[PDB]
Design a binder for this molecule. Structure first.
Ligand SMILES: CC[C@H]1OC(=O)/C=C/[C@H](C)[C@@H](O[C@@H]2O[C@H](C)C[C@H](N(C)C)[C@H]2O)[C@@H](C)C[C@@H](C)C(=O)/C=C/[C@H]2O[C@@H]2[C@]1(O)CO[C@@H]1O[C@H](C)[C@@H](O)[C@@H](OC)[C@H]1OC
Ligand SMILES: [Mg+2]
Ligand SMILES: [Mg+2]
Ligand SMILES: [Mg+2]
Ligand SMILES: [Mg+2]
Ligand SMILES: [Mg+2]
Ligand SMILES: [Mg+2]
Ligand SMILES: [Mg+2]
Ligand SMILES: [Mg+2]
Ligand SMILES: [Mg+2]
Ligand SMILES: [Mg+2]
Ligand SMILES: [Mg+2]
Ligand SMILES: [Mg+2]
Ligand SMILES: [Mg+2]
Ligand SMILES: [Mg+2]
Ligand SMILES: [Mg+2]
Ligand SMILES: [Mg+2]
Ligand SMILES: [Mg+2]
Ligand SMILES: [Mg+2]
Ligand SMILES: [Mg+2]
Ligand SMILES: [Mg+2]
Ligand SMILES: [Mg+2]
Ligand SMILES: [Mg+2]
Ligand SMILES: [Mg+2]
Ligand SMILES: [Mg+2]
Ligand SMILES: [Mg+2]
Ligand SMILES: [Mg+2]
Ligand SMILES: [Mg+2]
Ligand SMILES: [Mg+2]
Ligand SMILES: [Mg+2]
Ligand SMILES: [Mg+2]
Ligand SMILES: [Mg+2]
Ligand SMILES: [Mg+2]
Ligand SMILES: [Mg+2]
Ligand SMILES: [Mg+2]
Ligand SMILES: [Mg+2]
Ligand SMILES: [Mg+2]
Ligand SMILES: [Mg+2]
Ligand SMILES: [Mg+2]
Ligand SMILES: [Mg+2]
Ligand SMILES: [Mg+2]
Ligand SMILES: [Mg+2]
Ligand SMILES: [Mg+2]
Ligand SMILES: [Mg+2]
Ligand SMILES: [Mg+2]
Ligand SMILES: [Mg+2]
Ligand SMILES: [Mg+2]
Ligand SMILES: [Mg+2]
Ligand SMILES: [Mg+2]
Ligand SMILES: [Mg+2]
Ligand SMILES: [Mg+2]
Ligand SMILES: [Mg+2]
Ligand SMILES: [Mg+2]
Ligand SMILES: [Mg+2]
Ligand SMILES: [Mg+2]
Ligand SMILES: [Mg+2]
Ligand SMILES: [Mg+2]
Ligand SMILES: [Mg+2]
Ligand SMILES: [Mg+2]
Ligand SMILES: [Mg+2]
Ligand SMILES: [Mg+2]
Ligand SMILES: [Mg+2]
Ligand SMILES: [Mg+2]
Ligand SMILES: [Mg+2]
Ligand SMILES: [Mg+2]
Ligand SMILES: [Mg+2]
Ligand SMILES: [Mg+2]
Ligand SMILES: [Mg+2]
Ligand SMILES: [Mg+2]
Ligand SMILES: [Mg+2]
Ligand SMILES: [Mg+2]
Ligand SMILES: [Mg+2]
Ligand SMILES: [Mg+2]
Ligand SMILES: [Mg+2]
Ligand SMILES: [Mg+2]
Ligand SMILES: [Mg+2]
Ligand SMILES: [Mg+2]
Ligand SMILES: [Mg+2]
Ligand SMILES: [Mg+2]
Ligand SMILES: [Mg+2]
Ligand SMILES: [Mg+2]
Ligand SMILES: [Mg+2]
Ligand SMILES: [Mg+2]
Ligand SMILES: [Mg+2]
Ligand SMILES: [Mg+2]
Ligand SMILES: [Mg+2]
Ligand SMILES: [Mg+2]
Ligand SMILES: [Mg+2]
Ligand SMILES: [Mg+2]
Ligand SMILES: [Mg+2]
Ligand SMILES: [Mg+2]
Ligand SMILES: [Mg+2]
Ligand SMILES: [Mg+2]
Ligand SMILES: [Mg+2]
Ligand SMILES: [Mg+2]
Ligand SMILES: [Mg+2]
Ligand SMILES: [Mg+2]
Ligand SMILES: [Mg+2]
Ligand SMILES: [Mg+2]
Ligand SMILES: [Mg+2]
Ligand SMILES: [Mg+2]
Ligand SMILES: [Mg+2]
Ligand SMILES: [Mg+2]
Ligand SMILES: [Mg+2]
Ligand SMILES: [Mg+2]
Ligand SMILES: [Mg+2]
Ligand SMILES: [Mg+2]
Ligand SMILES: [Mg+2]
Ligand SMILES: [Mg+2]
Ligand SMILES: [Mg+2]
Ligand SMILES: [Mg+2]
Ligand SMILES: [Mg+2]
Ligand SMILES: [Mg+2]
Ligand SMILES: [Mg+2]
Ligand SMILES: [Mg+2]
Ligand SMILES: [Mg+2]
Ligand SMILES: [Mg+2]
Ligand SMILES: [Mg+2]
Ligand SMILES: [Mg+2]
Ligand SMILES: [Mg+2]
Ligand SMILES: [Mg+2]
Ligand SMILES: [Mg+2]
Ligand SMILES: [Mg+2]
Ligand SMILES: [Mg+2]
Ligand SMILES: [Mg+2]
Ligand SMILES: [Mg+2]
Ligand SMILES: [Mg+2]
Lengths: 110, 117, 147
RNA sequence: GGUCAAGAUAGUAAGGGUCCACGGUGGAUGCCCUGGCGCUGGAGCCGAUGAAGGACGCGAUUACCUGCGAAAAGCCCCGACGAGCUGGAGAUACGCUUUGACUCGGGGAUGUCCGAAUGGGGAAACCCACCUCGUAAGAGGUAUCCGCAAGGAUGGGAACUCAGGGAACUGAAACAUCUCAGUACCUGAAGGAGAAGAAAGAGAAUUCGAUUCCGUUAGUAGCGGCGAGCGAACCCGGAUCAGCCCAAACCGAAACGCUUGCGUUUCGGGGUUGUAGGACCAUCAAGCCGAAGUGGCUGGAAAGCUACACCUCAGAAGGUGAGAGUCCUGUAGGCGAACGAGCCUGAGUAGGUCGUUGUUCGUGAAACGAUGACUGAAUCCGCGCGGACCACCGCGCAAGGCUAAAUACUCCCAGUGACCGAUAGCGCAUAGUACCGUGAGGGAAAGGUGAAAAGAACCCCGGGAGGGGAGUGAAAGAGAACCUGAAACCGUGGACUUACAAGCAGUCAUGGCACCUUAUGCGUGUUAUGGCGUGCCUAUUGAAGCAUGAGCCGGCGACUUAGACCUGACGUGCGAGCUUAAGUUGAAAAACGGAGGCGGAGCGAAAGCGAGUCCGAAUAG
RNA sequence: GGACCGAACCGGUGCCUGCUGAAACAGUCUCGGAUGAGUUGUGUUUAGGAGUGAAAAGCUAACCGAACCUGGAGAUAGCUAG
RNA sequence: CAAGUGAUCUACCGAAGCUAUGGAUUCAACUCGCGAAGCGAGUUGUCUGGUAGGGGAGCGUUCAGUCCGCGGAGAAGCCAUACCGGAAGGAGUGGUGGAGCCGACUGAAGUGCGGAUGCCGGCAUGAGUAACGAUAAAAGAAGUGAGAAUCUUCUUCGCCGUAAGGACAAGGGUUCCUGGGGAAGGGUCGUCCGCCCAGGGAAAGUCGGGACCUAAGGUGAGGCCGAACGGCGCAGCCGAUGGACAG
RNA sequence: UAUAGGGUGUGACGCCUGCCCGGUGCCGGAAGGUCAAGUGGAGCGGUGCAAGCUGCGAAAUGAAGCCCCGGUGAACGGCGGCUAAGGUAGCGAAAUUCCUUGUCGGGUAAGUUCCGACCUGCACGAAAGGCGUAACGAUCUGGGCGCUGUCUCAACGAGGGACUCGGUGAAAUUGAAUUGGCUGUAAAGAUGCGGCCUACCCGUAGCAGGACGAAAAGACCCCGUGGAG
C-alpha cells in the first residue's frame, strides 16, 4: 500500500522550533511546531487552518458544531530560520551543552 | 515485450459501425452483423454503379419513343431516321429533354421522317 | 502454469471440447510463443569493428573533431575549471560532447551537464562518439599509430 | 354561396422504425503502483541446549494479521540515534520519555502444549503415572541405537549431488529386437555442494602425467531389425590446479602360544614405490558528515516560464499542490563502534567356466571392466594391460585409506531489464484463503476520493435507503457503489416516419420533409415510390441452403524459439585467402584469445597413386 | 416348523404420476418376505488387474469390460475444427 | 381480327464484349539528374477475373536508441464529425478528461480476430411467462407498527395422536434464554425467525466415559523374513459395540 | 484328519442314465526313436626357433519331456451322406419346426395362438442329464365363471391445476429477421429464388402439421496401418 515517507523517517526540525511555509498557500507564514510526525511526515503549525464540522454525536453536543482547527502539512513548511527566511542548515559544534550539535545556515545557531 | 490489442480493434469496429448509419436492427449496432451487411453491400454497390447507366438509357428510350408516337413515329423509326439524316448524334439523354421542349422534337420528327421517304 | 488434470467429459456434456485449463486459449493459462530468456549477442567480424570506429572518427574530422594535446590545465580536479577550459576552447554550453583521456583528474571533471560524456582509452566505441556532436579525443594515443 | 353526384387526396398512432439529444447499466481503454517475472551476482544447512510446522494463550477495549510465551504486542546488558513513542488499526481512555524512551545493530534471559517427541497411552496439541529436591508452591529425571566414557544418531530441507530400484505412452508411419531412457517416479545417504581423484591408465610420439568442468576434435571412429536411430576418445585450446597417509619385511615388548633363544592380534620406532623403491649388511554489519537560488509571471498550488546567480569528486534517485542540480531525504567524497561476522610390497584376491551388463559395444572375430553360482596364482630372470589369439615390442604395479580449488542448484538476499502493469505479471497487488472433495487433491476474483479528510455541522422529503440545498476544495463535472468510464443491454425527450403490407433487410434512382460548426450545391438526417438483389464462414464436384459453427458485445486467443546444424537469396568486411570458440583483462564502453572451422585436388571398394585416377591382360568407358 | 395371515421392519411386483422433479431413482395405489439362508447398531478387516460377488462384468463414495488423485505430459493424433 | 408457324427483307432494343472521354497500375523501349547500376521520374505501345500457391510495395500496435518538440491557458484515453490518401489509414475542429504525450529515423516483437459446440466477463431473448416444494382448511375480534392476509393476544374451526406426542445415541456447534435489529437468507410479506448485534445460560464422589477389564481388530522389546522403504510375530499393551461399579 | 478337506459338473423325489477310446486331456507302461547342459576329447587350425600359449571341435555317454503301447465318458468330445462309431429307454411340429397357419380332432358363430393325437425330428435324447412328478410361483401360455367405463360411447359431479388480479420470478434455445399459399426451380423436401394467388396493425386462450423443431460433434454402417475387455 504505497509505503509511507521515503525521507528515511527523518524530520528536519523539532516540535519546539519556529518555521515558515515555503510553498502553496501560506507560503511565507511562520509559527511554532505544534506537532511533528516523522514516520508519516506531517507538521502541525498555527499557519494552516480548516473548519472541521465534527459530526454531531451528542457526545456532550447533541447538535454538532464547526470547530476551527489547524490541519497538518509536511516537509513543505521550510525548516528553521534566522535571517528572516528559510535556509539550508549545517551541523555545528559543541557548546556548554557539549554533547550537542546545533544548526546554522550562513550564520549563527537556532 | 507484450503488445495487446489496445486501441486498434475498437477503432476498426467503430469505422464499420459508422458505415452502418440507418441499418435496421442489429445490422447497425452489433459489429459482426454490420461488417457482414457491408460485404453484401459491396456487391450491390459496384454492380449498381454499372447498372445505373442501363437504367437511364432505358428511361430516355421510354420518353423518346413516347414523343415519337405523339407524332406517328416510334423509337425504332424516329431514331433510325435521325441516324440517316447526316447523323445527328444527339445522345438519348438529349433527345428526351427535347421531349420537354415539344416544338423542337417535332421538327426532329419531321426531319427523321424526311431522310426516310 | 500451475493448474490441474482433465476438467470434464470429452464427449456429451454439451460444452466445448477442451481438456485442461492451462492453455493459450484459456484466460489465465499459458502463452503460446512467449518470450524466453536468450542471447542476442554475436561476434561481428573484427575488421568491420575497426573499420567502423575509424569511419566514426573520420566522419567527425570532416566537420568538428578536436585533439587534446598531451594534457589540459585543470586546477586540482575542480569542475569549474574544466568549464572554464572548455569555454576557452570554444565548447560553449551547447553541444553535447564526448571526452577521452587517461589521467584520473581531467575526467574527474566528468559531470555530464549536457556535457562531458566520459571514456578512458580503449573505452572508445562507434556508438559513444556517433552519439555526441563534438569529440574531444585525447590527442596522445589519439594518433599513436598501430604496428 | 346551398343541396345532390362523381372523383381525388389529408391528418389520427395502440405500437414500431432510422437519426439526434440526455441518462442508466457495465468496467473495456488511457494513466498509475502498493505486486510479480527473468538474469547476474551474493549467501547457503536447522534439530535432544527441542528443528521444521502447529495448538492454545498474552492485549483497558481484540474478531483478523503481526509480535511475543504465563516473566507473554513483552524482560536485562552493550552500541547507535536525540524527540518522540504509545504495532497493521485508520479507535477514544491510561500513560511512558533528556535520568535518553521509540526505532536500528549485538548479546543474555524467559520460552505453556503438540510435533523426530522421547516417562506411559493416545483419535497431534490431550489422558494417566513413577523417582529425587522442596514448607508446599514449584524444579529436575524417566525412548530406543553406538559407545567404559566424553560424546554421537533419530527429524527437517526449494533445486542441486551420489546411490538401490526403475516405467509406459511414444518412434520405428503396424510390432516383438531397438527407441523413448537409465528419462518419469519411489526409496536410501549428505553437504553448502556433492561426485571423482593421485595410473596395474590414456595411447602409438620409446609422448602424457591425479580428478573435475568448459571449448574442440565431430556428427568424425564406430554402434544399428546395418532400419528408425543412437554416438565416442586421443591430440590441441582454457578454468583450476596439491598431493599426502597406511599393511609388510626389521627392532623393544607383553599376554598366552606350544619341548626347549619361536607366532596368530595389538603399541612405539621404520618404512611408503615402476627411470622399482624399502628392508638388513659395507573488508563487511547500526550510523554520522556532507556544495550551491533569490525576485517577478501564469496557477488552486510551481519544481513550469522569465531575469539575473551559484555548486559540481556531489546532474543516481526518490519525495514535496505540475516537471526542482542549489526545499527535503542522497556514497561524490569522508569518518565509524561496544564489540559482532569473515627376505618384504595388499588374496578366497587376479584368472577361469555358467548367467549378465557398462563403454560408440544390440554375441558380433568381443578385448577390457563389473559381477550372481562354482572354482581358483604368482611374486622380480614376478604380475596386469595394449580390442579373438601368439611372439616381439611398448605402457603400468591391483587386490588399503584421506584430499581443498575450477563444477551444479536457487528457499534466502542485492542490483539490473528494447519483461509485465490488474483477463498481464506468481495461483495470490496477497490467500493456498473463500469455495469444491471422505481423502490424496483442486482452488478463485478482487486495485484507484483528494494535493491535503479539510470525509460534508446545519436545513429540507423519507421509518430507512436515497436524494436536494448549504459548507470544504482548483474541482463534488472528486462524496466514500468515490480516476478514466468504451460496447453490448435498459430508458426518457425530440426530428422524420409507419395500420392493403410478401421482407438476407441492403443497393442504386428520384420526389417529400428537416438541419447548416471539415457545411447552401453542399450536402447531412430521415422518408415515400421505382429498379436490382439467394446472410458469413467452413467444407465441397457443387452452399441462400432444410449441411458445420455461432445469443450479443467487450477483452484473452494460434506458424514461434533454439543450435559454431544444413541449403538458398539479398547486403556488408576482407579477398587467394576468410574467421574465431572456451576463456583472460577491462565494462557508463571493448579489446585480446589460431585450439579449431571453411576455400585450397581429384579418382578409387581400400592400399594408394596423383592432373590425373578407376575398372581391364594397352587403348574401349 | 428355511409352515400360514399379517403390522413394525427388510423389499420393490404392475399401473399411473413425476421427466428444467418434491427427489440425479422418488410418490400414491398394488405387491413379496415377515423365527429366518432373517433385519439393524457400534467397532473393525479385504482395493485396482486388485478386493468382493446365492454371479449382473454386479459393486468397489451419484456414468467401473478395469476406481479416484497427481504425475510421465504440450503423450500420439495420416483425423475435424480454427 | 397471331402475339402460332415455313421462307424472305430490313429498322430498332440488348452485356462489365467493342467504342468515346478521363485517370491509375504491370512490363518494354526512347529522354534525363548522376559517378555507379538504379532510384525519382516524362512519352508512346502495351497489360491489368481469380481458389490453393509463388513474388512486390506498403499501413497500424507495444517496447528501445537519437532527434524534434508539446503539456495544468490542459497530456493520453474516450466521444461527434460532411476533410485528406490508392488501401491498410491519417489530420482539422468541438465535447469529456485530469497528467503525461505526438512526429521523424533506426532496431526488437507476446503486433493486427467474426468464426475455433473457442476462453473470462458483462448484458440480452424465452417473459412479466412457468413455478412459489404435498388437497391437514381456515375465520373473526383485539393489539403493535412508518407500514400487517402473514407478528402478538382472545374465541372458534380443521390435522396427527405406535404421531405429525415424548426421551436418547450419532451428527451439528450457541442454533438455547433476555434485550434489541430488519440490509441481505426466508420461494410473497415481515413489526417475525433456526437470520444480524450484545449480554447471560451449561454445575455431578453416586448418571456415560477416564484414573478398571478384556473381543474382533491394531501394536508389538526380544524373535522370524525381506533390492530399499518395508512384511510378520509370543508375552505384553491399545481397543465397547460387551464385563464391573456407591442415590 | 478320508464319515475330512479342495476342485468340477449335475440340481428335491421316482423310473432310469444307451452306442463311439479314432483325435485331445488324464492315468498307467516301457523293447525301441528322439532330446540340453555337463562328462569326453578323436582330430582340424593360428603363433612361436623352442618350451609352450592358444581358436574350433567328433564319436561314446547324458534327464525330465515328446514319438510309440494300453486303458479311460456323471473327461473335452462325437451318434451322418439321394471316419471309432453311427441313437438303448424315453420324448417329438417342442422355450428345439425351416417349408408352416403341417394333417386330424377339441374348444369358438368364426381359433396364424392354445389342448390332444400323428410322425415327414430343416438341425430332441439321457447328471451342458432323459422322461415324469404332489406342493410352491408378484413366473410365462390358453380357456371358463363373476364383475366392471376396457369397450358401443360417452355423460354428470368433485377436488388440485390450467384462466383473471396483487407479491416474488426462472429455463432450455437463440446467424441475424420487416419470418404467407400454390406451382416451378434450385446440392434432389424453399418464408427467404421464379411466376401466380392471398394477406390492414398488435395481443390473449388454445392445437401440434412445418421451421428437415430442441437435446447428445449417430450407439447402427464404413473408414483409422485408433483404443480397450
Ligand atoms: C426421458 C428420460 C431421460 O431421457 C431418456 O431416457 C431419453 C431421451 C432421448 C429420447 C434420447 O434421444 C435419442 O437417442 C437415440 C440414440 C437417437 C434418437 N434420435 C433419432 C433423435 C434420440 O431421440 C437421448 C439419448 C437424448 C439425450 C439428450 C440424452 O442422453 C438425455 C438424457 C437424460 O435427460 C434425459 C431424461 O429425460 C432424464 O430422465 C431421467 O430419468 C431417470 C430415470 C431419473 O431418475 C432422472 O435421473 C435423475 C431423470 O433425469 C436424469
Ligand atoms: Mg452498356
Ligand atoms: Mg498467469
Ligand atoms: Mg365522396
Ligand atoms: Mg404510447
Ligand atoms: Mg519491482
Ligand atoms: Mg516453534
Ligand atoms: Mg485479557
Ligand atoms: Mg495469533
Ligand atoms: Mg515461568
Ligand atoms: Mg538502550
Ligand atoms: Mg529515532
Ligand atoms: Mg497511524
Ligand atoms: Mg509423548
Ligand atoms: Mg530424555
Ligand atoms: Mg510414542
Ligand atoms: Mg509406432
Ligand atoms: Mg530423492
Ligand atoms: Mg535426511
Ligand atoms: Mg587440457
Ligand atoms: Mg530555477
Ligand atoms: Mg575376476
Ligand atoms: Mg561373460
Ligand atoms: Mg541384433
Ligand atoms: Mg589380453
Ligand atoms: Mg573380465
Ligand atoms: Mg594388440
Ligand atoms: Mg602392488
Ligand atoms: Mg508496458
Ligand atoms: Mg491475476
Ligand atoms: Mg478485471
Ligand atoms: Mg464439503
Ligand atoms: Mg472440508
Ligand atoms: Mg489516498
Ligand atoms: Mg438529516
Ligand atoms: Mg441522508
Ligand atoms: Mg454528481
Ligand atoms: Mg468523476
Ligand atoms: Mg457499478
Ligand atoms: Mg449512495
Ligand atoms: Mg451511500
Ligand atoms: Mg489523480
Ligand atoms: Mg468512476
Ligand atoms: Mg411524450
Ligand atoms: Mg423515441
Ligand atoms: Mg398505406
Ligand atoms: Mg426501398
Ligand atoms: Mg457431398
Ligand atoms: Mg448454389
Ligand atoms: Mg434456414
Ligand atoms: Mg446453416
Ligand atoms: Mg445450434
Ligand atoms: Mg560453423
Ligand atoms: Mg415363514
Ligand atoms: Mg436388492
Ligand atoms: Mg420402502
Ligand atoms: Mg401372498
Ligand atoms: Mg411364503
Ligand atoms: Mg486378473
Ligand atoms: Mg456407483
Ligand atoms: Mg457429491
Ligand atoms: Mg477408464
Ligand atoms: Mg494434447
Ligand atoms: Mg514423453
Ligand atoms: Mg497411436
Ligand atoms: Mg472493356
Ligand atoms: Mg482510354
Ligand atoms: Mg502510359
Ligand atoms: Mg481482363
Ligand atoms: Mg489480378
Ligand atoms: Mg485541454
Ligand atoms: Mg504509455
Ligand atoms: Mg479519426
Ligand atoms: Mg493532478
Ligand atoms: Mg498473438
Ligand atoms: Mg466470438
Ligand atoms: Mg475466417
Ligand atoms: Mg448447444
Ligand atoms: Mg458466457
Ligand atoms: Mg410442484
Ligand atoms: Mg396505531
Ligand atoms: Mg389471524
Ligand atoms: Mg396460511
Ligand atoms: Mg405463526
Ligand atoms: Mg385480549
Ligand atoms: Mg417425536
Ligand atoms: Mg454431540
Ligand atoms: Mg428462539
Ligand atoms: Mg425486511
Ligand atoms: Mg444493518
Ligand atoms: Mg423477502
Ligand atoms: Mg415481496
Ligand atoms: Mg430474538
Ligand atoms: Mg488391557
Ligand atoms: Mg488378544
Ligand atoms: Mg504387525
Ligand atoms: Mg495378534
Ligand atoms: Mg459401553
Ligand atoms: Mg453404578
Ligand atoms: Mg462407569
Ligand atoms: Mg448430592
Ligand atoms: Mg444347471
Ligand atoms: Mg452318457
Ligand atoms: Mg398344432
Ligand atoms: Mg416356428
Ligand atoms: Mg368346431
Ligand atoms: Mg383346428
Ligand atoms: Mg404370442
Ligand atoms: Mg401339440
Ligand atoms: Mg438339449
Ligand atoms: Mg451331457
Ligand atoms: Mg435340468
Ligand atoms: Mg419334461
Ligand atoms: Mg419366490
Ligand atoms: Mg407377463
Ligand atoms: Mg389368464
Ligand atoms: Mg374442475
Ligand atoms: Mg409480415
Ligand atoms: Mg425441377
Ligand atoms: Mg416447393
Ligand atoms: Mg429477397
Ligand atoms: Mg416465393
Ligand atoms: Mg386487407
Ligand atoms: Mg402441448
Ligand atoms: Mg433435430
Ligand atoms: Mg461424428
Ligand atoms: Mg491394435
Amino acid at each position: 500500500p504505497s509505503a509511507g515517507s521515503h525521507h528515511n523517517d527523518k524530520l528536519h526540525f523539532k516540535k519546539g522550533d519556529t518555521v515558515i511555509v515555503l510553498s502553496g498557500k501560506h507560503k511565507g507564514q511562520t509559527g511554532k511546531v505544534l506537532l511533528a510526525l516523522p514516520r508519516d511526515q506531517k507538521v502541525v503549525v498555527e499557519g494552516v487552518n480548516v473548519i472541521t464540522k465534527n459530526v454531531k454525536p451528542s457526545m456532550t453536543n447533541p447538535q454538532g458544531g464547526q470547530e476551527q482547527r489547524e490541519l497538518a502539512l509536511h516537509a513543505s513548511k521550510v525548516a528553521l530560520v534566522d535571517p528572516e527566511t528559510g535556509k539550508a542548515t549545517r551541523v555545528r559544534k559543541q557548546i556548554v551543552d557539549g554533547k550537542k550539535v546545533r544548526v546554522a545556515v550562513a550564520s549563527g545557531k537556532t | 515485450p507484450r503488445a495487446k490489442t489496445g486501441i486498434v480493434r475498437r477503432r476498426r469496429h467503430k469505422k464499420v459501425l459508422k458505415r452502418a448509419k440507418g441499418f435496421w436492427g442489429s445490422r447497425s449496432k452489433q459489429y459482426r452483423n454490420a461488417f457482414q451487411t457491408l460485404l453484401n453491400a459491396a456487391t450491390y454497390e459496384y454492380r449498381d454503379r454499372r447498372n445505373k447507366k442501363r437504367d437511364f438509357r432505358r428511361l430516355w428510350i421510354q420518353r423518346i419513343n413516347a414523343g415519337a408516337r405523339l407524332h406517328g413515329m416510334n423509337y425504332s423509326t424516329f431514331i433510325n431516321g435521325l441516324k440517316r439524316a447526316n447523323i445527328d448524334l444527339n445522345r438519348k439523354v438529349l433527345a428526351d429533354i427535347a421531349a420537354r421542349e415539344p416544338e423542337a422534337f417535332k421538327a426532329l420528327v419531321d426531319a427523321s421522317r424526311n431522310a426516310r421517304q | 502454469s500451475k493448474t490441474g488434470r482433465k476438467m470434464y467429459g470429452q464427449k456429451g456434456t454439451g460444452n466445448a471440447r477442451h481438456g485442461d485449463r492451462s492453455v493459450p486459449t484459456f484466460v489465465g493459462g499459458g502463452v503460446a510463443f512467449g518470450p524466453k530468456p536468450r542471447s542476442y549477442d554475436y561476434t561481428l567480424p573484427r575488421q568491420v569493428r575497426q573499420l567502423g570506429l575509424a569511419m566514426a572518427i573520420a566522419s567527425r574530422q570532416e566537420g568538428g573533431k578536436l585533439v587534446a594535446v598531451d594534457g589540459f590545465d585543470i586546477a586540482d580536479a575542480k569542475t569549474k575549471n574544466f568549464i572554464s577550459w572548455a569555454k576557452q576552447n570554444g565548447l560553449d554550453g551547447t553541444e553535447k560532447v564526448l571526452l577521452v583521456t587517461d589521467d584520473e583528474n581531467t575526467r574527474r571533471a566528468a559531470r555530464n551537464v549536457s556535457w562531458v560524456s566520459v571514456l578512458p582509452v580503449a573505452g572508445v566505441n562507434v556508438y559513444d562518439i556517433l552519439r555526441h556532436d563534438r569529440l574531444v579525443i585525447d590527442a596522445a594515443a589519439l594518433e599513436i599509430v598501430e604496428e
